[PDB]
């Protein structure tokens, strides 16, 4: 059955690949092959096929009533169709490679390759329009703890997706762990500092002098704007946390955990959208320091939590690298000890 869903996909793709805007005024075939394939490969396809392309869904291509629109409104669709097709070439390879584990789809928006920093599928964040982002909803003991991702890739599309997510998921706060020296060594965008326009989203972040005085943290107030929507999310930038290492003292971790918890902490217990009002955390890779920070927030919510289960649950909801590095795990243990004392 896949002999068809593969060849009939190894020819239909290059068709959409080569398509213009008005060249839209294969698609019924492409979806046929996919429906046929319909495991870890099917969920990958389900996600892609579910991305909205014209206030609808690619798995619809009401689309006709919409096409007959402006030259501009069709180019934005074709461009979206190029992105999906590009991704689908992955399924082509996975079949042509003839599947228990599959990272969620990355529309080239991910900073690091999934082969190095994988993205668990079922917990991968998706926007209202179903566009997947390189972020995972870390969960411990069945409950979502934070949105962890790698440092946003330096591309207008990746940053636009990052900000859209911040505004839509209404994250309690943004927590950046990379130092000024690391940011200025890998050229990470200080997107959380000034004013930038990333697509349909505008961001204006002003430093909060009163709370950025300490020699360890710079706090900002970030105002995001998109259409009729507005949303301000506090930002916590840690400057004294060297990569691949724990904080200078166990007290600084606890302090860090406190300020993160004491900056928004909104969100309702047992809420249906357990995906909202969570802190968005990132260092360079969304695994090391990011994992620790998140773990530290777990101990503050409940200092009894089994740190080994925290680690195992963080690995099932993002990847195997969460909390690698013994150095940091030892500090967590120390932290828990004080909280228990």
């Amino acid at each position: 059955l896949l002999d068809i869903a593969l060849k009939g996909l190894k020819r239909t793709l290059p068709q959409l690949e080569q398509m213009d805007g008005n060249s839209l005024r294969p698609l019924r075939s492409l979806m046929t092959n996919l429906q046929n394939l319909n495991k870890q490969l099917n969920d990958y396809v389900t996600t892609l096929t579910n991305i909205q392309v014209g206030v609808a869904r690619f798995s619809q291509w009401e689309v006709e009533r919409w096409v007959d629109a402006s030259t501009h409104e069709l180019t934005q669709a074709v461009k979206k169709i190029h992105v999906i097709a590009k991704e689908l070439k992955n399924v082509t390879a996975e079949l042509e490679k003839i599947p228990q584990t599959m990272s969620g789809p990355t529309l080239g928006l991910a900073r690091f390759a999934v082969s190095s920093i994988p993205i668990n599928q079922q917990t991968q964040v998706k926007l209202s329009d179903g566009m997947p982002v390189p972020v995972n909803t870390l969960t411990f003991d069945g409950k979502p703890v934070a949105l962890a991702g790698s440092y946003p890739k330096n591309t207008p599309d990746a940053l636009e997706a990052h900000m859209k997510m911040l505004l839509e998921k209404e994250c309690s706060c943004l927590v950046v762990l990379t130092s000024e020296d690391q940011m200025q060594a890998k050229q990470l965008p200080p997107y959380f500092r000034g004013s930038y326009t990333f697509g349909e989203v505008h961001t204006n972040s002003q430093k909060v002098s009163s709370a950025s005085q300490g020699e360890a943290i710079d706090q900002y107030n970030m105002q995001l704007s998109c259409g009729e929507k507005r949303y301000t999310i506090p930002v916590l930038h840690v400057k004294n946390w060297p990569d691949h290492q724990p904080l200078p003292s166990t007290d600084q971790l606890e302090y860090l955990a406190d300020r993160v918890k004491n900056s928004n902490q909104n969100g309702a217990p047992g809420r249906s959208s357990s995906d909202k009002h969570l802190p968005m955390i990132h260092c360079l890779g969304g695994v090391g320091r990011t994992g620790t920070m998140a773990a530290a927030l777990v101990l503050k919510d409940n200092p009894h939590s089994n740190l080994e289960q925290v680690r195992a649950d963080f690995r099932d909801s993002r990847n195997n690298r969460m909390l690698e590095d013994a150095s940091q795990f030892v500090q967590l243990k120390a932290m828990q000890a004080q909280l228990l004392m």
Side-chain angles (χ1 to χ4, degrees):
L1 172 56
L2 293 60
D3 310 61
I4 303 178
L6 193 169
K7 303 306 299 181
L9 189 158
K10 184 174 180 60
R11 71 175 177 67
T12 187
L13 285 182
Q15 301 298 295
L16 290 300
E17 175 80 64
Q18 306 304 305
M19 181 184 272
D20 294 290
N22 59 62
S23 300
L24 189 74
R25 49 168 49 175
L27 289 172
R28 189 183 186 301
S29 179
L30 175 60
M31 251 84 284
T32 303
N33 301 59
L34 307 177
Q35 293 292 173
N36 298 328
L37 293 171
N38 195 302
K39 168 54 182 177
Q40 288 83 178
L41 192 61
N42 294 302
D43 280 4
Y44 184 93
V45 174
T46 298
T47 293
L48 294 170
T49 299
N50 204 295
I51 295 166
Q52 299 210 310
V53 182
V55 193
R57 204 180 312 160
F58 195 46
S59 67
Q60 220 66 52
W61 296 59
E62 61 175 302
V63 178
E64 178 64 68
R65 181 195 307 189
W66 184 80
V67 176
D68 300 299
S70 69
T71 323
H72 178 79
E73 301 184 69
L74 253 61
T75 58
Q76 298 313 306
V78 173
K79 182 166 61 180
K80 182 63 80 68
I81 296 182
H82 288 318
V83 181
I84 299 177
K86 195 178 191 296
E87 264 278 293
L88 285 175
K89 284 177 174 291
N90 284 300
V91 180
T92 306
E94 284 288 294
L95 290 173
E96 190 169 62
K97 190 176 297 183
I98 306 178
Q100 299 185 182
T101 164
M102 280 238 91
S103 264
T106 283
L107 314 179
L109 298 179
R111 180 174 205 79
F112 293 112
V114 294
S115 53
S116 176
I117 304 279
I119 310 167
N120 183 254
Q121 234 188 297
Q122 281 285 293
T123 60
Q124 179 181 37
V125 181
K126 264 89 72 187
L127 307 165
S128 293
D129 60 22
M131 205 194 89
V133 290
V135 178
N136 279 294
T137 299
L138 235 50
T139 69
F140 167 56
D141 200 11
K143 298 191 179 187
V145 168
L147 305 192
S150 291
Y151 201 105
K153 180 189 186 188
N154 193 42
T155 266
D157 287 345
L159 289 165
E160 162 171 37
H162 184 60
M163 307 313 275
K164 278 184 187 293
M165 171 184 84
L166 252 30
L167 175 147
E168 281 174 45
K169 296 299 181 156
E170 274 174 50
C171 300
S172 26
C173 63
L174 177 64
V175 193
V176 186
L177 308 175
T178 56
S179 73
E180 193 57 31
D181 255 59
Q182 180 166 49
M183 285 176 65
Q184 264 180 167
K186 313 305 278 288
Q187 301 77 58
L188 312 170
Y191 72 86
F192 57 89
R193 278 173 174 162
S195 302
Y196 300 80
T197 294
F198 301 121
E200 310 177 330
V201 181
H202 178 83
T203 180
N204 179 53
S205 165
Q206 55 184 49
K207 166 177 288 187
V208 179
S209 61
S210 175
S212 304
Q213 209 54 56
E215 188 77 67
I217 303 172
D218 283 339
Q219 171 175 159
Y220 301 72
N221 220 241
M222 184 176 277
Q223 294 166 63
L224 307 174
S225 301
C226 177
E228 295 183 304
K229 314 200 140 311
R230 314 264 174 289
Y231 182 66
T232 293
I233 170 180
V235 185
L236 287 179
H237 182 194
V238 181
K239 287 209 164 193
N240 55 315
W241 197 340
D243 176 32
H244 301 294
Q245 312 185 313
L247 284 175
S249 70
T250 296
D251 289 289
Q252 283 193 303
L253 185 57
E254 181 172 357
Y255 177 61
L256 237 176
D258 283 326
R259 293 199 60 188
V260 177
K261 199 57 193 62
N262 300 308
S263 63
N264 196 92
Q265 62 196 299
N266 255 36
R271 50 180 175 297
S272 174
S273 306
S274 50
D275 196 289
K276 305 172 64 185
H277 318 290
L278 307 173
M280 193 305 312
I281 301 173
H282 84 251
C283 40
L284 213 213
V287 301
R289 286 167 294 176
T290 292
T292 303
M293 254 287 294
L297 291 166
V298 164
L299 284 168
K300 274 288 180 175
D301 172 83
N302 183 181
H304 258 145
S305 297
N306 186 314
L307 291 178
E308 290 189 298
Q309 204 57 268
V310 172
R311 178 170 60 190
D313 281 1
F314 278 6
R315 293 180 177 177
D316 294 319
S317 56
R318 175 147 166 71
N319 65 233
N320 313 276
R321 288 221 259 157
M322 297 306 301
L323 284 161
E324 56 187 358
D325 185 71
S327 326
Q328 291 165 36
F329 195 66
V330 175
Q331 188 171 64
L332 284 164
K333 294 174 68 172
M335 172 163 161
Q336 178 172 49
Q338 316 198 313
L339 290 179
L340 283 176
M341 287 286 269

